[PDB]
Write a protein that binds this ligand. Structure first.
Ligand code: GO7
Ligand code: 22L
Length: 276
């Protein structure tokens, strides 16, 4: 609602974490933000376009990120509108995006079953929060999740061009009805969560990596399912299949998916990937 305003001089730019057509993302030090933390690290999203439509869309977005407050939703600290670029201040997630983290902690040390379940459960938690507010993410993927201190996994949205097919759609994460009709609901977000589970248990591999964007559309629209990852116990694959029901009305709700994952996270199945 009422967006926090950070003074430009309170932001000290330390390095560039990445960029896009939108502008740049920086690692920065931020003064007078949190109590007892005189200086703290943050990630700063800087917008290239400073036009009236760009300023209005920014305020809309900043107000929305201000409402979204949860343990597994990336923290929004405020804005800086002291000229171009317009700056959005978020918490710094030291391990970067979940996809990169998964791959870099894959068997290619490696994350064990319990760690994978914790990751999965944390993403499910953030989604229960979003589903509660009737908020549709539309782009749930491990590349839009972030990992901070203590393997704390939170959901974000960066806005990985190989993951989208031309409007640029993340088809491999999309259920049949979103590919065909461009309709995004909590039920399609559930489908995406199931693909996010597959990604977790493949250590960030691309769903349908053997196939091209146009071949993957055929797979999904013909009801062809992603195979059970070798590191995935059958109990979790059961959860993925429930997320992938062809009919949106027949997919499990995220609250249920979370409950089953939270249960598995506390008492993990005795499963060794090496045996299958
Ligand atoms: C990809 C790479 C180049 O390899 C690494 O780039 C990095 C590395 C690290 C960081 C970091 N934060 O430490 C980083 O920051 C960005 C991540 C994406 N952003 C959001 O997710 C904001 C947001 C959007 C929607 C939300 O609400 C929702 F979507 F959850 F509903 C909540 C938050 C903005 C910014 F935070 C980029
Ligand atoms: O971020 C970078 N990447 C690769 N080389 C370099 S040299 C300097 C930077 C930098 C330093 C502070 C803010 C922003 C950028 C940098």
């Amino acid at each position: 609602a009422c967006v926090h305003h950070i003074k430009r001089r309170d932001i000290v730019l330390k390095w560039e974490l990445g960029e896009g057509a939108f502008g740049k993302v920086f690692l920065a030090e931020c003064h007078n933000l949190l109590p007892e933390q005189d200086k703290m690290l943050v990630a700063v999203k800087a917008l290239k376009e400073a036009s009236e439509s760009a300023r209005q869309d920014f305020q809309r977005e900043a107000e929305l990120l201000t409402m979204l407050q949860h343990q597994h939703i990336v923290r929004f600290f405020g804005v800086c509108t002291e000229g171009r670029p317009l700056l959005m201040v978020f918490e710094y997630m030291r391990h970067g995006d979940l996809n990169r983290f998964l791959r870099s902690h894959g068997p290619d040390g490696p994350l064990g079953l319990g760690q994978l379940l914790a990751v999965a459960s944390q993403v499910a938690a953030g989604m229960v929060y979003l589903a509660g507010l009737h908020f549709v993410h539309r782009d749930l993927a491990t590349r839009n999740c972030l990992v901070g201190q203590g393997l704390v996994v939170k959901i974000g949205d960066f806005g990985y061009s190989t993951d989208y097919y031309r409007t640029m759609l993340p088809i491999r994460w999309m259920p049949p009805e979103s590919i065909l009709y461009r309709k995004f609901t909590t039920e399609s977000d559930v489908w995406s969560f199931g693909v996010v589970l597959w990604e977790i248990f493949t250590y960030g591999k691309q769903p349908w990596y053997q196939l091209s964007n146009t071949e993957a559309i055929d797979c999904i629209t013909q009801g062809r399912e992603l195979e059970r990852p070798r590191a995935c116990p059958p109990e979790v694959y059961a959860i993925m299949r429930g997320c992938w029901q062809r009919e949106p009305q027949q997919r499990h709700s995220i609250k249920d998916v979370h409950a089953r994952l939270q249960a598995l996270a506390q008492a993990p199945p005795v499963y060794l990937d090496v045996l299958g």
